[PDB]
Amino acid sequence: ITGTSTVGVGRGVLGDQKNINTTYSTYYYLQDNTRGNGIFTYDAKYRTTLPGSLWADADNQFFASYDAPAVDAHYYAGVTYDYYKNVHNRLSYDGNNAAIRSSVHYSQGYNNAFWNGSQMVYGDGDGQTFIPLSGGIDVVAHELTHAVTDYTAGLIYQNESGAINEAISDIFGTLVEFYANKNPDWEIGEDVYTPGISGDSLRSMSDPAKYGDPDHYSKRYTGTQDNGGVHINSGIINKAAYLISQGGTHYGVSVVGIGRDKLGKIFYRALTQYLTPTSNFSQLRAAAVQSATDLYGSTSQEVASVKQAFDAVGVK
Ligand SMILES: CC(C)C[C@H](NP(=O)(O)CNC(=O)OCc1ccccc1)C(=O)N[C@@H](CCN)C(=O)O
Ligand SMILES: [Ca+2]
Ligand SMILES: [Ca+2]
Ligand SMILES: [Ca+2]
Ligand SMILES: [Ca+2]
Ligand SMILES: [Zn+2]
Numbered sequence: 001i002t003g004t005s006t007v008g009v010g011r012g013v014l015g016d017q018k019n020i021n022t023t024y025s026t027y028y029y030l031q032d033n034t035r036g037n038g039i040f041t042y043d044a045k046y047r048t049t050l051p052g053s054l055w056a057d058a059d060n061q062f063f064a065s066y067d068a069p070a071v072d073a074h075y076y077a078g079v080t081y082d083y084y085k086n087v088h089n090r091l092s093y094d095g096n097n098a099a100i101r102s103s104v105h106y107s108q109g110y111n112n113a114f115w116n117g118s119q120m121v122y123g124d125g126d127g128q129t130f131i132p133l134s135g136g137i138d139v140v141a142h143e144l145t146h147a148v149t150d151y152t153a154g155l156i157y158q159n160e161s162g163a164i165n166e167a168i169s170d171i172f173g174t175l176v177e178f179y180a181n182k183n184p185d186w187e188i189g190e191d192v193y194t195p196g197i198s199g200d201s202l203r204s205m206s207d208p209a210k211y212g213d214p215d216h217y218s219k220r221y222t223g224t225q226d227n228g229g230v231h232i233n234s235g236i237i238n239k240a241a242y243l244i245s246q247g248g249t250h251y252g253v254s255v256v257g258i259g260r261d262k263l264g265k266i267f268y269r270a271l272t273q274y275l276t277p278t279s280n281f282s283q284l285r286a287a288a289v290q291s292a293t294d295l296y297g298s299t300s301q302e303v304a305s306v307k308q309a310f311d312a313v314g315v316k
Contacts, residue, residue, distance in 0.1 A: 001025050001054065005033045010062025012072040013135025014191060020074050022060055030055035030074045035081045036097030041074040044103040044121070051103045051119055069104040069132035073122055076140035077102055083141070083172075083179045084148070087261075088268050093147035100144065104134055113139055115146035129194060136192040141176035142169040153275035160280040162230035167237035168271055170205060175264045186242055205242045208235030215239045216251060217281065217314035236313050237284065241267065243309040253312035256305050266291045266306065285310040 003025030011017050021032035021039075030041035031054065044052035055070050062071050077100050084090040091097045101119040110123025113133040120143045122134040133139050146169055149155055155165035170188050178184040183191075187201035194200055204210045213235030214220050220236060221229035243250060244266070247257025266288055274287035288306045296302040310316070 001029055001031060003029070003031075006060060008057070008060035008062055010067055010071040012075065013068045013132050018071065018075050020062065020071060021078065022057075024060070027056040027058060028060040029057075030070055032074065032078055035078055035085075035100075036092045037099045039074060039077045039081065039100045040102070041070050041077070042101065042103040043070065044106040046105055046108050046124075048107050050106075050116065050121065051101055052105075066105075069122060069124060069134045072132075073102040073104050073120070073134035073140065076134065076137045077120070077144065079137060079180050080141045080144045080176050083176045087175075087179070087264065090148070090268075093144060094151045102134070104132065113143050115143050115150070117150070120144060120147075125192065128196070130189075131192050131195055133189075133192050136189050137180055137182070138170075138173035138177045139189055139192060140173075142173035142188070145169040145172040148172070149271065152272045153279065154277040155275065155279060156277050157227055157230060159228040159230075160233065161278055162227050163233035164237055164275070164279060164281070164284050166230045166234035167241065168267065170203065170234060170238050171241045171267055172264070174205060175260060178260055186246075203231070203235065203238070205235075205238040206246070208239055213238075215313065236281065236315065240309045240313045240315065243312055244305055247305075248312075250312040251314075253308060255308040255312055256301060258302050258305050262296075262302055265295055266302070269294065281315045285315050 003023040006022045006024045008020045008022040021034050022028045023031035032039040041055050042051040043055050104122045106121045106123050109126040111125050111130045113122045124132045149165050149168050155161045186206040187204050189202035193202050208215045213232050215235055217236055221232045243255040245257055245260050245263040247255050269291035270287040292303045292306045
């Protein structure tokens, strides 16, 4: 909407106060004009018709329980925009400052979040498996990263290409979580998963097997559930990424860690310059090796560690 840029204040899903960029025109709208061609957050009002209505508020204060998922979807989309722009020189998900749109309060009891081809969508959860999913910065960044993937490598959402697609979203979700630097970890979704159980998460990148996901190619899932295991076999690539960054010895193979920033540079370059819609795990290894070679040189530690990490997870 046309209006003037304003700054509201509110509370997110976990009860924390934050400022949000809004727009005033009769109402205050969740429309942040400070980033690209805007970040826009919508109320889906417990229905499934998208996007719903641009979020309107009478007083620019967002402290109601119903407001909390909107506050976080809006704010964490901004953090994710900032990560891609400041760290990777990428302007929004399309590289051309496309408007970023999110809807919250999608459906009833909906234990998921997704990119629908055009926008982000967040359930409220059922209160048992999830609370409103936009409360997780790693979740928000996971969803926006699907849009980045779709505009770049275009990885098809099935089998190995789909597991790479998933891992890319977990990797950058985690790197955004570290960028914001509030309780960062290598776990996925911990801030919104199972409010009655402490210390768990939906997936682990440091130890995927903690939640039944494979940590070696020999343990990959080969069936048809979950689009051929896209959220399962992502563990193999998540583990490789974790090892590149943090190091470790895994199934007897030692990896010298090179840190998060270099992980992110290598995988961003692989995603945007080398991967294709049908890339498999072996082709990802090759893309990561080439990316590290471009950035750091063929004889570098970074290249050697990429090879070590893929060896450790059984990907040649
Ligand atoms: C990070 C966590 C919290 C959420 C994440 N969701 P996602 O990966 O982005 C789900 N996207 C998806 O399916 O896209 C395909 C699609 C959909 C609509 C239009 C076009 C293409 C996830 O891991 N979900 C799991 C667990 C959900 N309980 C799961 O779906 O099995
Ligand atoms: Ca208000
Ligand atoms: Ca965390
Ligand atoms: Ca996390
Ligand atoms: Ca929990
Ligand atoms: Zn995903």
